[PDB]
Amino acid sequence: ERFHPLLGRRVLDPAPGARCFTGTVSSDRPAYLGEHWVYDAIVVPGVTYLEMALAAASRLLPGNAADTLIVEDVTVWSPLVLRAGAPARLRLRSEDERFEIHSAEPERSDDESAWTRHATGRIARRQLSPDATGQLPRLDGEAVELDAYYERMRIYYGPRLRNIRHLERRGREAIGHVCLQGEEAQESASYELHPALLDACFQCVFALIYAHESHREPFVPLGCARIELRARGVREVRVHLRLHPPRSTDHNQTHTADLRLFDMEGRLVASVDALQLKRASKAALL
């Protein structure tokens, strides 16, 4: 059995059609979980659940290694607040093509009534047509000032989650270069798509958005229409992203974006269709 740092192990579930995983996480392990905050609280980023779902597709659905892993119609909510160092159980349950992800205290607080739901969606996998190299589009534009972006975002992200090396924009489109180093690089093959790398791609979208509106009350992923993953355990990509035209010119409650991640030879690694972003209120978090 192939274990996973977030999914954990297969566990029996009383529901007969169901297949289930459970694992323990804490802000110390995976270590990236201790470096993301909203309103000064440690909060598990939604890319965590996207990786759990990809990892489930890999393990539950039959196929060749070259098959594309697909997460569809995925909604995230109810931010999981971690107390530093205190373990939390994460559980992914799958029935037919659907999954749900819940968390609970280890000791529990009512057995099954003690689980809080964080994510739902569908998983799939398909043998898609071969991916050629050299497919990253050209974009000559203006370099985004990333030092000033990182300085603003240090209230949400620690040094483990500053992985954008360069970001060039032309209107609402951009190309970013994202590279992991350190522990995240070393452990990237344990993941289908390391959450720190996917988060860095989503931060390229934030960097476009925050050039024109405030980074306070931050946009958080709410879900996406589709994720397709064509290669696993990558640690370095170039990402092409497109922000949809916003409703307002100065301050929005929501945004939508599409992303396409490429390896350094320009073969497509992943696609994210219609990522939905929504500003998070502090109310009720703490």
147 is catalytic: no
Q: State how far the alpha carbon of 161 is from the alpha carbons of 54, 100, 119, in Å.
A: 21, 26, 22
36 is catalytic: yes
Closest Cα partner for 35 from 212, 147, 182?
182
Q: State how far the alpha carbon of 254 is from the alpha carbons of 15, 51, 101, 132, in Å.
A: 37, 23, 24, 34
Q: What are phi and psi of 54, to 5 degrees?
A: -60, -40
Q: State how far the alpha carbon of 145 is from the alpha carbons of 51, 62, 137, 210, 243, in Å.
A: 29, 44, 21, 11, 18
Choosing from 199, 240, 255, 258, the catalytic residue is: 199
Closest Cα partner for 279 from 99, 154, 156?
156
Q: What are phi and psi of 283, to 5 degrees?
A: -50, 130
Number of Cβ within a 10 Å radius of residue 31: 16
Question: Look-up: residue for tokens 């603003």?
Answer: 152
Choosing from 4, 36, 118, 194, the catalytic residue is: 36
Residue 254 parent element (H or E):
strand 254-262
Please list the active-site residues. 36, 199
